[PDB]
Design a protein around this nucleic acid. Structure first.
Ligand SMILES: [Mg+2]
Ligand SMILES: [Mg+2]
Ligand SMILES: [Mg+2]
Ligand SMILES: [Mg+2]
Ligand SMILES: [Mg+2]
Lengths: 126, 292, 208
RNA sequence: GGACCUGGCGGUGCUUCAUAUCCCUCUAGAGGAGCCUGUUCUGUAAUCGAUAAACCCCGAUCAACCUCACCACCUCUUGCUCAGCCUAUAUACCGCCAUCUUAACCCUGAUGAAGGCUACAAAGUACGUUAGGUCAAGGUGUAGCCCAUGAGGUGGCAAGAAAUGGGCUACAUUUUCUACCCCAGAAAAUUUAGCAGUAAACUGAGAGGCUUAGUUGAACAGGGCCCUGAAGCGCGUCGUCAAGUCGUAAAGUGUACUGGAAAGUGCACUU
């Protein structure tokens, strides 16, 4: 263009800035590690990193939004939001596959909670 | 944009959800209320987000969607209001009513409504000069011998601000087992807390933690502070004081005791004297404390 | 400030409130009614309704204070007043019948007149322009001159040339000197009055 | 050739005030002494350089015959262990800090360029960036020397002088010691804050120079600006030798005379 001539849909998580994390947004992962006195916060962080990368590479172009990783006791719930573009048979295949891999990789009863949506739920435009 | 059919579906959905929530919480759906909805949604969907609006909420759809879009004419197209073509039917109707009342009266603490809240009541945007016009008409109505109907009409547009100074709560006069009248009061200064009992009759004896006041307060400044209340109202040597002070230091304890004795002595003086003590600074808790 | 702007200063005068309603002017009556509405600050530790209260001596005591030690400052002040009283009684008992009528024994009268004798009328204020601060004579306000008298007295009594002479005795002697228009504080007033007459070139700048 | 219109000056000054921060005034403390650091000059072959690596076993500390570092001479060699070095690089990434940037509609002018306000209302309404710092409470790599950037041995090295910048100690008579917690006895120039529970003085608790809890408790408190804010008036609308490879920020109109003419005077007219 020209020098003084210079002088995108976003979901809720994308729209709101980091300084709203406890004001408007929430926390994607929920666990006891960061509480006072509790241990293994770093191990939970590393587990979260691996889960997010694995899920984004195992459901490519399906996840409409970011994961929600809940932990109760030794349970590990992945609440994901996906699109209605892939066939349900492939979704069932991938759910079973991912559940079994993550259970045998983290030695805990992992479980997965797909929620399909017709399309990205755009909050605003930035 | 929200069509009326959309809002209708939202209303029926909300009613069905209301009965469902009453079912889940075990309450009677017939008497289930909006406050109950708020409490139940808070319980079932706990959220600590500081933004009050950000929490999950179940409102009646009219509360959520902007429903100011009221139609001003029927199917035949005739507008309902005879001042419709002015474009400010509400404001000019109100002005017309005020002018009519002023005509009738001619034939015979609190604050004014602000511009934005007047717009909210009228549901119409208005400028500053017309707001001034309306306020001057309201002033004219007030100055005249406005009757009860006109008084309440003005009160519709007069917001309430409470002023409650001058009034020191006078502690009750109790009677001890010996039949003597006394009054008890509390005071605080920095970290020192004092509680004093002033007797109606006495010989001027002050007793601090069971110790005479000149032995408990070696420094003359503190004794002057204890003297100030009784001296101010010219009753030195006419009351007995039994006070218990704890915490703080020398001067803080003296100030707490002074405040306690003044607040207890307000029971045995005339109301004019109470006001005088209030103006002399003798009945105010000093709020100055160490800042972090 | 922990006080809101609404809060007003208290009036500790005790004879003001007893003024009869009849003597009240309409303006004073309006002020009295207006104070009824206002919030009032708590009276600070210090001034009271006592009849022996003296604001000037209180300010002198506060100006002698070091490190918040008010007990010591007031102790020194009362020691000074006692010393002045005893010295004047000494001089009165040794004086002739006709010299006794002119010996002041009230230490408060002596203190007030001594401070009054040390107040300057004119001072110098520097003013900035051209890179050169300019010293212009100025008529001092009443507050400024009352402050300067006290500051000069205290600085004169804190001089290190007075080795092991205790402050009450130095201050009583200096006060009794100033009571008679003698001493170094009166000379410090004179040396400012002369150094303001030596510079009457810029004597008419009225906008310091 | 005649009439009219838009303008634009990335413009120029002033006027008044809101004028808070910032001022200026005003208030209260902060220079001497002894050591330690910064810079400079002078001087040496050289470093008055450092102790997850001495000493000390009150605190700290200087040089210590510790040891590393520097200077001058030498020695060792397949050696320690397919050895050995904290030698470089975040000018490798990650991490941690910091810098900077982030339209429509309706009227008027004869339907011309064009214009549209009055409230006791007269057409106007709608993330990147960085030769950045940090290798001490942290990582993932990449390079270097490998008869030496490794291991030893023998001596030296241990500076001098000023002016200024900074830091640590003691600095008292309103003091110091005891009993008490306040009526006793003995001793002898810039700068930093200000705006109040603040400055100053004095105690406690912590994680092991930094975070929290208290006690006593002042002095001064007036004038004007920079700059945005609120408006108003005015002004203002460059030249030259051959174009820049050039330089720079009462008043008028005529006419006559003019030899002290950067224009003046005389006569007649105009606003
Ligand atoms: Mg050395
Ligand atoms: Mg080495
Ligand atoms: Mg760097
Ligand atoms: Mg001529
Ligand atoms: Mg001429």
């Amino acid at each position: 263009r020209e020098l003084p001539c210079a002088w995108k849909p976003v979901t809720y998580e994308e729209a709101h800035a980091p300084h709203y994390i406890a004001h408007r947004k929430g926390w994607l992962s929920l666990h006891t590690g960061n509480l006072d006195g509790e241990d293994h916060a770093a191990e939970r962080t590393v587990e979260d990193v691996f889960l997010r990368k694995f899920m984004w590479g195992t459901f490519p172009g399906c996840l409409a939004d970011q994961l929600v990783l809940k932990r109760r006791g030794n349970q590990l719930e992945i609440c994901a939001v996906v699109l209605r573009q892939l066939s349900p048979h492939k979704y069932y295949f991938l759910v079973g596959y991912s559940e079994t891999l993550l259970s045998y990789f983290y030695k805990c009863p992992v479980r997965l909670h797909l929620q399909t949506v017709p399309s990205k739920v755009v909050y605003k435009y930035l | 944009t929200y069509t009326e059919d959309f809002i209708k579906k939202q209303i029926e959905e909300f009613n069905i959800g209301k009965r469902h929530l009453a079912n889940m919480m075990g309450e009677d759906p017939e008497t289930f209320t909006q406050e109950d909805i708020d409490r139940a949604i808070a319980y079932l969907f706990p959220s600590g987000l500081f933004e009050k609006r950000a929490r999950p909420v179940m409102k009646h759809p009219e509360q959520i969607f902007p429903r100011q879009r009221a139609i001003q004419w029927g199917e035949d197209g005739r507008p309902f209001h005879y001042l419709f073509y002015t474009g400010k039917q509400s404001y000019y109707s109100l002005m017309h009513d005020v002018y009519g009342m002023l005509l009738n009266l001619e034939k015979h603490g609190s604050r004014w409504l602000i511009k934005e809240e007047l717009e909210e009541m009228l549901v119409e945007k208005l400028s500053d000069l017309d707001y001034m016009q309306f306020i001057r008409l309201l002033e004219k109505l007030l100055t005249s011998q406005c009757g009860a109907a006109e008084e309440e009409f003005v009160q519709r547009f007069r917001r309430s601000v409470t002023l409650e100074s001058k009034k020191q709560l006078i502690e009750p006069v109790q009677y001890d087992e010996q039949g003597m009248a006394f009054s008890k009061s509390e005071g605080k200064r920095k970290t020192a807390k004092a509680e004093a009992i002033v007797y109606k009759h006495g010989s001027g004896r002050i007793k601090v933690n069971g110790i005479d006041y000149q032995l408990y307060f070696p420094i003359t400044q503190d004794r002057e502070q204890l003297m100030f209340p009784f001296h101010f109202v010219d009753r030195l040597g006419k009351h007995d004081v039994t006070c218990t002070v704890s915490g703080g230091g020398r001067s803080a304890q003296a100030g707490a005791i002074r405040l306690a004795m003044a607040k207890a002595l307000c029971s045995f003086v005339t109301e004019d004297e109470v006001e005088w003590m209030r103006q002399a600074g003798l009945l105010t808790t000093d709020p100055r404390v160490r800042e972090r | 400030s922990r006080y809101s702007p609404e809060f007003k200063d208290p009036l500790i005068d005790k004879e003001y409130y007893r003024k009869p309603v009849e003597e009240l002017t309409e303006e004073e009556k309006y002020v009295r009614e207006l104070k009824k509405t206002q919030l009032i600050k708590a009276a600070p530790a210090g001034k009271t309704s006592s009849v022996f209260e003296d604001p000037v001596i209180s300010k002198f005591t506060n100006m002698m204070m070091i490190g918040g030690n008010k007990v010591l400052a007031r102790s020194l002040m009362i020691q000074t007043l006692e010393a002045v009283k005893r010295k004047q009684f000494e001089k009165y008992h040794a004086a002739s019948a006709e010299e006794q009528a002119t010996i002041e024994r009230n230490p408060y009268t002596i203190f007030h007149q001594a401070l009054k004798n040390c107040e300057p009328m004119i001072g110098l204020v520097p003013i900035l322009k051209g890179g050169r601060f300019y010293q212009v004579p100025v008529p001092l306000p009443d507050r400024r001159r009352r402050f300067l008298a006290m500051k000069w007295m205290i600085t004169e009594c804190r001089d290190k040339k007075h080795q092991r002479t205790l402050m009450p005795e130095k201050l009583s002697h200096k006060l009794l000197e100033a009571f008679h228009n003698q001493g170094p504080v009166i000379k410090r007033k004179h040396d400012l009055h002369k150094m303001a007459e030596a510079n009457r070139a810029l004597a008419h700048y009225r906008w310091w």
